[model samples]
Target: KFGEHLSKSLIRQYSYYYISYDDLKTELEDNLSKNNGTQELETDFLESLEIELDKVYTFCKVKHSEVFRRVKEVQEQVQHTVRLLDSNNPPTQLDFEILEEELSDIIADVHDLAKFSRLNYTGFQKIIKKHDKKTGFILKPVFQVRLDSKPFFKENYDELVVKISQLYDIARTSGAFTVLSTKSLFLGQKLQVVQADIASIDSDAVVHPTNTDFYIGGEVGNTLEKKGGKEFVEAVLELRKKNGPLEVAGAAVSAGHGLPAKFVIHCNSPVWGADKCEELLEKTVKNCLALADDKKLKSIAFPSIGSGRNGFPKQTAAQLILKAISSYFVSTMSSSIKTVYFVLFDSESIGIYVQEMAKLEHHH
Candidate 1:
């Protein structure tokens, strides 16, 4: 199935602060009472200002209202006075003084409002940024890109293989994913090459980057059966007959054994010379992902697909493989994919994976 559509309903309502009309009215009344007995004020000015300020409270209360018939004439007069500035029209001398005083009051009120709102805004922005990051967690389709080794440095491939070898050595020491290399590769390097049984490396899955034939007959496959068991060969042969070979752009097939894994997903990568190699590679990766999801396997390992006999460049193969898997993982964030290991046979492959991981980290 295609991935789920992103829902815009994920956006939250925008919160806003509004003036409390009752509070405004109470404050104005309190101020008028407090000043009335203090000095001999002009009762006319006091009454007139009280009436105008009361209008402000009324305006706040009916903010969503359609009209204010009582204030319509006064509002029109204010609007006309303000329009004098629109065409570089200077205000009359008397108009300028009154406008200036009103503007000063407006500025003072704005300052008071802002002082009350500053902390609230800062906290709101922080919450918004946090939500943004969380909402960005969506699966990106990566296989849509054109495939080419040029995206990777030549040395990057070799570097990854070395890293994987070293890591494998650590795994061996730490009793993690066991080493199947006798005198060969691992997650890390110690300048030691020793032969080991791939079968002895107990794991839920052991990957096979095979060709179309689905024959278990490669360096990886041979080691798997030699150490894992002969059943691996027989199991893969039967599956191959039933599933038939997937026509890849530029690749061969080998027998796929069930090996240590509950299921051996026989993936076919395109041969470099195959005209539709890129397309096939993408399809292969997608199929593998769907297979893994359907089977509900938590832990799965993969070799560098198309890097071996198919002659796909190591770096190119690494990018395509990693991109596809990452795409699948992100797309199915709500799914039950626990761990995915891109098992590299040599230092070159590991280096490529590490570089891609670093780039991905920086990007996110």
Candidate 2:
């Protein structure tokens, strides 16, 4: 009874933060084994477990809150940049200086929090690195405006707006950030249906449909490589070399070299009309979600798996993919995925996805 109560409390309190129930169960077992087999001893053990769990929960809560606060600060800074861009005015040296100072402070805060939560260090570093590079780009225009009397601020004004928007997107999705808008294609999970190129979506990560061999030549694969640059292909190749080939329906993650997203999840789905194609597509979707949860990515975008060059029926593929995502979230309470987007490339695909999504809404 005590164990059941403890499990329930942990699940209720910490599962959303990615704390593993199995780990807590192991902790309980270890503590129980060290105690005498008396009712008093068991009660004492439970009390001690509660204390330890509380400490862990408190630590996670504080660190997660800090990270969320910093991300918001970064978002506000980006918003200020957007307002400047809206005025069709180039950022002055003072504007650049202020933004730089704010970003540097936030970067330091991120590092400190990441150090507190060692599991988050790599993901946090990626966000910081991207922000640092973008800040440098924003500064370049400011320097040009000061140096050249004929410098065309309007030439790069739109460019600046796009870059600032990308920064806001990264800040908004970074590290345990909660979903701000609950408007979703599905009722239960925070799923959005978007009619856009998958590569163009700004997210913590994007899923790419690939064959088991990790080939980079198909239509979707080519677009991912083109937008992501050679470095993206190289990263995927290196990962394959280190881990060997990915099995069909399996997924692997790599840094998103030149793409707007910070990471890319490569999923292998079988060709259309093949035996068990639906099953493989389902596994592919689940694996992508699992990978995102494992990495603590806040948002992810997916292309219709097996619907593209793989030739699976668009409507059927949409249904299976959405069902897999919904099932994963329903079965696993500890996932860190805050948003899932179905980014479609064409109107027909978009229509099919919308039609299928409506079916999910009806059932809900």
Candidate 3:
């Protein structure tokens, strides 16, 4: 949030796990000057690259939890201490300052980690290719695969931004952060966030973000099929007949049968533990909304996908889902989906959705 590039400020904290790009560049220059006959220089470069890789890998392995745990610790500190008995005691002026200041640092750390990952990954990729050019060894094709296997290259960076922002806002805005109903009119349509069972929603369509095979996979399916009855199952079966098959991130729309909504759009919701969890969720949510617009559905309801039994961190799903819907409406310009209900099952997630959705920017 502070800088255009977090990389500039990254030098301030956590030195143990950084990429030695500057030193490595000097090594590369010195080695290249020595000429191509000696494989020793190239070998040294590769070993040092691995050393840097190992450093980054170890940090990402632990920092995944450690980063957010730090924020939660501060959050708990604000709640437990600072003259509080669950009533409005008002925060100590100097105390809240340090809490917020630490969070600001944590925020910068998150940004820096992202930039750090980018710098190291690209640094390795380019260096390997340069090595091949100088020494004529084909390492990049395989090195590229190795890079993807690293935890630093994985998705959830965007999720980290969301989670960090959520925590930071709670710390900053002591008066805000409520788990109440949110009525948001976004992109020429009304969007509502509420804690409720998705099966009972009476929209023109209730998007059930579920499995790929059209079979019941998790909580959403169990309840939808149980409440909507056998007729809904038969309807989904019929959908499979015409749509051929649904893959991960696919959306299949069919009659809701006995359900309150006329149509149920089943999204083959991707798993949370996936390398591209955020991407898969963003696509599936977008597809469902696209289906709604194409079908000329006036009102649509969406169950927060990738959360609950799917094991996705709640804020990630909320941010991606809300982003997908809002961005769709923004691009689609005039949409047939007049009213949208982003329905959630529990209070905690509802609050997350409310907070995440509120972060959406407003424009004419």
Q: Evaluate all candidate structures by whole-model CA lDDT and list the values in order.
A: 0.48, 0.66, 0.75
- RMSD value for candidate 3: 19.2
Query: What TM-score against the true fold does each predicted structure earn?
Result: 0.43, 0.50, 0.48
Off by over 4 Å in 2: 1-188
Best by TM-score: 2
Error of 1 at 227 (Å): 2.5
**If the candidates were sorted by their TM-score against the true structure, best first, what order would they fall in?**
2, 3, 1
Top candidate by lDDT: 3
Error of 1 at 45 (Å): 93
* Model 2 vs truth, CA RMSD: 27.4
lDDT of 3: 0.75
The segments of candidate 3 whose C-alpha lies over 4 angstroms from its true place after superposition are 1-180, 183-186, 362-364
Q: Write the per-residue lDDT of candidate 3 for residues 215-289, one digit (tens) a residue.
A: 764667777888889899899888988887798889989998989889999888789888887888888888888
Model 2 residue-pair collision total: 0
